[PDB]
């Protein structure tokens, strides 16, 4: 029925790179109106590239349209760290859906440590009646990582859901916030609270409190 | 430099009905076609509806019948009159400039809109106090989604606000902001948090726990 | 982003200067295309061939300008209100240093169609040209636009009695080319031109060429 199937699906690595992201339709399709949209993380679809190889304003020289009937291609010839983003096939001639799955573009990096953040429950949360203990996984790379939640050295792994900002657009990091949401009590049956985060320094960056102590 | 500004993007119930406005400036409204295009949960971009300056209209197979794109030229606005609507249709509303066909050149930030039958909760804002880096816990607030800035607007690298997630049909999302070690206490930090289906706004001090 | 290079063949006739229609490269010599463009203003000074230009009011590199030789009208070509009929044209060109376009990436001729024959109806086909739109695009569309259509059939046409059978008719959707530009439509997959734009971009009716291949020897021999 005409799909843009697009892959990678999502795509990775280095600045500098000349990455190309294919969309590929079957059941072939003009290229004139074959179109590639940017999602930066958090902000909205850019045009990208129109016609299939041509750029919309201020899409940099990097990205190029290429392309013609079942097989487009978007061409960054140097990813920047900026690039981080997904990249969308669009074209009126693929029904039902006129996008394609988009690739993410992971821009690689250098390794990163998680700058990691511990963070005990806020009087407004005790006051509540919840307590949210959050952690907060900032700037690692690559997107991979893990967090060891351990409460009095013990490993919680209930009462535990993340977020990862979608790579970073100027460092293209990734940055995790863990919240090991406790109960009112749960908490304070307790002392030290730990999340913590694990292989290129093997030995994973602990930030460990304790609710009273201090 | 043509501004798009989606609206009315909002919780609404199961087979209830929603109507996103599109504010066109910058550009000539009755010479550009309007395209409504929706990204969902799972990020699947989805063309809801095109509208020829004409005001002739197209929809996607998705939501053609209980959707209405509209346009007022004498006002630029694009209007998406959402109808029928279903847990499918929860996603962000993007406004684009253009159409399918030509590409949309310009597109809305995006207003969102969550179908579901889940009362609105307004997001507890939870202030984190431990190079200081800080937080807002924005916790319990429903629907999609609440808007995080730093300083009303004045912290901005630094702040890393991740998505929210599900938990107990509640969204609960954080944003880390780092400053420097001078910076903080010093001079005043908030996670500046709008959820503005709840019309709640808050602004939490980060006060350190000492 | 110049996409002539995709179907070099199309060319841009100008009316010195404003865009009339487009054409065909089928010969160096001899661009087919639509009459009922011309035969407002029949005149072969009138008229200004493009080739290998990619887009409307900007001159792309490679472009070959053309002076009309000779413009050749289908002594039979009528326009009805809807319908046109026998709406090809031909024209011998020459450029200013005095000849027929030489085949670059950018400017070919298109093979005509074996002698009678015609694509299945859904088949895909192409038509290119800058094409007239209502809602406004930024390809704007100085750019020179091809777009698949696919080829329906005669009873397919939705008009009454136009199927002039000698006329194909195609659509896309959504719905684009120009009037006089081409349709090709890759035959035993070597890529011919199966008709002239007449009405059409409510799916084009396109002059089926397959027909006036006599015609066209009979004037570009």
Redesign the interface.
């Given at each position: 029925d005409i799909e843009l199937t697009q892959s990678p699906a999502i795509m990775s690595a280095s600045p500098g790179e000349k990455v190309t992201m294919t969309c590929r339709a079957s059941s072939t399709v003009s290229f004139h109106?074959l179109?590639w949209?940017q999602?930066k993380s958090?902000?909205?679809?850019?045009?990208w590239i129109?016609?299939t190889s041509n750029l919309?304003?201020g899409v940099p020289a990097r990205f190029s349209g290429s392309g013609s009937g079942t097989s487009y291609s978007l061409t960054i010839s140097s990813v920047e760290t900026e690039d981080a983003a997904?990249y969308?096939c669009?074209?009126?001639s693929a029904?039902?859906?006129?996008?394609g799955?988009?690739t993410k573009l992971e821009i690689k990096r250098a390794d990163a440590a998680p700058?990691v953040?511990?963070?005990?429950?806020?009087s407004?949360?005790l006051t509540?009646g919840?307590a949210?203990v959050?952690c907060?996984l900032?700037?690692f790379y690559p997107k991979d990582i893990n967090v060891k939640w351990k409460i009095d050295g013990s490993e919680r792994q209930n009462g535990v859901?993340?977020?990862?900002?979608?790579q970073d657009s100027?460092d293209s990091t990734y940055?995790?916030?863990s919240?090991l949401?406790l109960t009112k009590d749960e908490y304070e049956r307790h002392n030290s609270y730990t999340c913590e985060a694990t292989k290129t320094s093997t030995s994973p960056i602990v930030k460990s409190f304790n609710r009273n102590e201090? | 430099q043509v501004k798009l500004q989606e609206s009315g993007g909002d919780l609404v119930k199961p087979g209830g009905s929603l109507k996103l406005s599109c504010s066109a400036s910058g550009f000539?409204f009755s010479?550009?076609?309007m395209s409504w295009?929706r990204?969902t949960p799972e990020?699947?971009?989805?063309?809801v509806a095109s509208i020829?300056?004409?005001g002739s209209t197209?929809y996607?197979?998705?939501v053609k019948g209980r959707f209405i794109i509209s346009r007022d030229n004498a006002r630029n606005i694009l209007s998406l009159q959402m109808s029928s609507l279903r847990s499918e249709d929860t996603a962000m509303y993007?406004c684009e400039r253009?159409?399918?066909?030509?590409?949309?050149?310009?597109?809305?930030?995006?207003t969102t809109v969550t179908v579901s039958s889940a009362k609105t909760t307004p997001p507890?804002?939870?202030?984190?106090?431990?190079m200081v880096?800080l937080?807002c816990?924005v916790?319990?607030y429903f629907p999609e989604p609440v808007t995080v800035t730093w300083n009303s607007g004045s912290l901005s690298?630094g702040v890393?606000?991740?998505?929210?997630?599900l938990?107990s049909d509640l969204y609960?999302?954080?944003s880390?902001v780092?400053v420097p070690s001078s910076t903080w206490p010093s001079e005043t930090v908030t996670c500046n948090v709008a959820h503005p289906a709840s019309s709640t706004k808050v602004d939490?001090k980060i006060v350190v726990?000492? | 982003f110049t996409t002539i290079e995709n179907q070099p063949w199309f060319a841009a006739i100008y009316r010195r200067v404003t865009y009339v229609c487009g054409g065909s490269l089928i010969s160096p010599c001899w661009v087919i295309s639509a009459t009922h463009c011309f035969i407002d203003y029949p005149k072969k000074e009138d008229y200004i061939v493009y080739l290998g230009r990619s887009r409307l009011n900007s001159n792309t590199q490679g472009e070959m300008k053309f002076e009309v030789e000779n413009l050749i009208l289908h002594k039979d070509y009528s326009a009805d209100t809807l319908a046109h009929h026998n709406d090809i044209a031909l024209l011998k060109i020459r450029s200013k240093e005095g000849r027929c376009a030489q085949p670059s990436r950018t400017i070919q001729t298109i093979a005509l169609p074996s002698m009678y024959n015609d694509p299945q109806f859904g088949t895909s086909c192409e038509i290119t040209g800058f094409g007239k739109?209502?809602?406004?695009?930024?390809?704007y569309?100085e750019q020179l636009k091809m777009t698949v259509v696919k080829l329906i059939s005669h009873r397919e046409c939705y008009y009454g009695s136009e199927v002039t059978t000698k006329m194909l008719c195609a659509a896309d959707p959504?719905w684009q080319g120009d009037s006089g530009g081409p349709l090709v439509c890759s035959l035993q997959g070597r890529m011919t031109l199966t008709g002239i734009v007449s009405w059409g971009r409510k799916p084009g009716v396109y002059t089926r060429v397959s027909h006036f291949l006599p015609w066209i020897r009979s004037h570009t021999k």
């Open positions: 109106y179109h949209y999602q958090g902000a909205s679809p850019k045009l129109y016609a919309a304003s997904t969308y669009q074209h009126y029904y039902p859906r006129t996008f799955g988009g700058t953040s511990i963070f005990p429950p806020s407004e949360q509540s919840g949210s959050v907060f900032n700037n859901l993340n977020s990862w900002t979608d100027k940055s995790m916030s919240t949401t201090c | 000539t010479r550009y076609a295009v990204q990020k699947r971009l989805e063309w020829t300056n004409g197209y996607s197979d998705s993007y253009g159409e399918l066909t030509y590409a949309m050149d310009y597109w809305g930030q995006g507890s804002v939870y202030p984190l106090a431990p880096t937080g816990l916790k319990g690298s890393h606000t991740f998505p929210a997630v938990q609960t999302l954080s880390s780092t939490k726990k000492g | 739109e209502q809602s406004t695009d930024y390809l569309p959504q």
